[PDB]
Symmetry: C6
Subunit: 202 residues, 6 copies
């Protein structure tokens, strides 16, 4: 029930999945439980709305919300592999009850972007030789903010530039596109379906 081979979708998923498996420690009398930070893809406004809904009277925070915010042509015979160098901007937004949690989270993200982070993405159509796509992801800025009622809620937003590739729709009917990529430790993971990565904000 969606354009599976969407280039855009593939990038939202790739970025979501790099940040899909981040945990935070939380010492317990019985022992150290680690919780995975759930990640959503939604406009930030929408997310904050729903977050204030969910918030009205600690299992909800911490959480990450990713979203595309801008794109453009990437100024360095026909069009698609050879494809078009595009540049997408993402806003990764971390929400947290405690400064501690925030520190853990970012300390897991930040050190890999110097200021960039490379990943090699292999995307294969049906059964042809896969295409090799070189993806530079650059950490552009950080933005720090609070929100109060009484503790209440800490928000940090990282802005990332993904330097990727775009090309006209290749129908799902004409075969689904298999995708792999190198994670933060250069480990070739395979890009999961969208439903695998993002929690439903709905």
């Amino acid at each position: 029930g969606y354009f599976y081979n969407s280039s855009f979708r593939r990038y939202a998923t790739l970025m979501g999945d790099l940040f899909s498996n981040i945990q935070i420690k939380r010492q317990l009398e019985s022992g150290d439980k680690f919780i995975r930070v759930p990640i959503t893809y939604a406009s930030k406004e929408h997310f904050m709305m729903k977050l204030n809904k969910w918030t009205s009277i600690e299992t909800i925070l911490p959480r990450i919300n990713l979203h595309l915010v801008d794109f453009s042509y990437n100024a360095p015979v026909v069009s698609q592999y050879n494809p078009s160098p595009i540049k997408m901007i993402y806003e990764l937004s971390i929400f947290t009850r405690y400064e501690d949690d925030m520190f853990q989270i970012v300390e897991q993200i930040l050190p890999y972007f110097q200021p960039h982070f490379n990943t090699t993405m292999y995307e294969q159509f049906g059964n042809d030789i896969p295409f090799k796509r070189d993806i530079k992801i650059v950490l552009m800025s950080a933005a720090i903010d609070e929100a109060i009622d009484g503790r209440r809620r800490i928000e940090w937003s990282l802005t990332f530039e993904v330097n990727g590739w775009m090309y006209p729709p290749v129908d799902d009917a004409e075969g689904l596109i298999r995708t792999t990529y190198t994670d933060f430790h250069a480990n070739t993971r395979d890009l999961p379906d969208g439903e695998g990565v993002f929690e439903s904000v709905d």
Copy 2:
């Protein structure tokens, strides 16, 4: 009931028609239904007004609204073919219920502008040898925004610079102007009447 030979009109139609035939897939139980995105030419404010009227109905979105937003002299014996190098700015505005639809639409637009897209337009007066006009259309910027009540509505706006040609009114009575152009796949289509391309916002 309008200046048919209007230069401006010819450009609004040219741009409208490049984006006139865009569809989105929509998986059914019975099977994949494809729908053509209808396109209008109207001031953005006017269009949003009428859209909120119509909205008060998933047959309405997705839709595209095109409109001229600026122009100027294009700084690289009389005046008209040899004509005057003019530069027109258009705001192409896509409105959508689902992120998916949006992704499909843009993925059909974006990859052809690197950052420009050339088209050769042939305009012929009555029966003389047609004039050859070289038209550079440049994708300048993108702008992303939402709107909510409850889902509700996604808006992306591309801004395009059309580098075209202007010249004083050549009366309809003195013969109508036949127009052709190369589409996104360098296919010589012939520019339809205005009524053919744009749905009436009225």
Copy 3:
């Protein structure tokens, strides 16, 4: 009842008159109706005030009498300065005046026609040679560059309602201290958009009274 020999006035009139004779076609059952776009000289705010007054429907007598108001053009001076390239007046002082030409229209079509009659002559400038003669002396030759600086596009709504485009022009002209009307009226000619030597009319000839 006004300083006829006003340099400023001469420029307002020159600009008014370049844009004085613009028409739009208007297809009928009977046949094509051509209408001249009336032009006024007034501050833009004042003009819009009066336009909202005129456009308002107070009697049925109005209703009909209202698409007779648009289209129309409103010209006005908005800025000036010294034009950085023994006494003072012919030889005169190089001045630079800025004018805002403002087109108001019910239909996009009308607008397209109007501008397509203005725009193509400014690349980005348009030259005119103005001859101004005092009494009966040999006339002065004044070289006038008019440059189209910018365009600005905007709408206004109630229900259709009203389209506004504003061109901004730089007139590169000449200034000099008041030469009294009593000392002889100044005859003025100029080359129009097709290099045709028309003679600059009185002010009352060019602009409709906004009053």
Copy 4:
């Protein structure tokens, strides 16, 4: 009851007096009427306040000019006074008018003399010593055009001028009053009047 020898005051008066004697023609049945535009020195806000006071129900009030100092600074090109300090003062000359016509007349009398500057040689003499010669460049910096409405109503143009002048510490009135002359717009040596001579009282 004021520091007569004030340098500042001397400049406010010089500028006021350059624009002190401007008239406008006004055609009548009987015949042409000339009227001198009255000029005041006051903060613009104050002047507009008092102007709306005077305006409340009016044609003997406009046209009029209001001059005022708006800024100054050191003028980057053994002790301190003649030889004095090169200062730069900014003045806002503000013309208010009922009719566009009046405005046109007024400015057409001001504007053509500033290309973009206008020089004046000011002679200031202390008691009876040899007078000091001071070279004064006045530059027309900008113009600003605006309206105001109720019904016609009122047109406002403001010229901004840079006066390049000279400053030095207070020379007491008691130690002798300072005689001042200057070249007007036609290089005519007029003598700078008292302040009360130039400006109409806004009070």
Copy 5:
């Protein structure tokens, strides 16, 4: 009950502790008493909130509030010692009843930053040879403001750039990290626990 080995935490504590031991003289009939200015780590807004709560007495001011406000990659095989050059921004905010107190406080801070101040930080993991980390702290700006009801309250804020090092979380369980550093007089003090430095704003 917190990530002890947090890099971020280590820097908040280092900065807190440089400014932890500032006093002001206050001449008495019985003789000069010196009071240590208490220091907190909290968002400035939060701190001002709580400060107005506490204020509604002269035992509360003077006080300093420190907080992180921004960070970024510091543009001069894996990642962590060798670590990533990061740059953190801190807002040190002094609140005072009397101009005098303020003068004393800043005169103790300001002269050491010309415009920078170096410190050598030794961080040792368990028992390995310690790591040597060179830390440049730069005084970026100062900001002066008042607040009134009647005297009432003086606020000055110094903005500091800490040029430090970042690396992915090293678990507390894998051994706590011993930290020392050179203070303002090049004296090797050892970085205390967080609870030692900052007064609880809670």
Copy 6:
């Protein structure tokens, strides 16, 4: 009951004292009365608050003005083994703010300030600790900008603000107990005056 040897304080006093002795003439029937313009050190907002308090009427509204209010508004390191004489080149910003009932008064006041700053004004400050050889400190004070504004109810009140950059020296607190610091400086006519206590220069805004 303060840090007497405060570097900051020393500069606030130096600046206050350069502008401490400014008068205006005021012609009378008997004869010309001169009045010294009182000077305060306080945040501008605070000063205007208190000034509106004092100004709330009848006929003790003219003994209040004219007056000057000085205040520090910014500082920074002055980019041209330990730290203190040799000290650290600092740069302080001061806002000198003149309030006046009559344009005349204002003219007199500024005409006494303005001509000495071209655009700077140098002063040599000698600061001596106890009885050692005094330190020589070269102080450039630069007039940065002027700002002109009014305020009305009916006349009412004229405000001009000069912004000055003092290029001075900073160093860590030298305790009052370890000996008070004697300070002299060259005034506007290069006359070596000695910097008074703070209480001598500024009227209490309190």
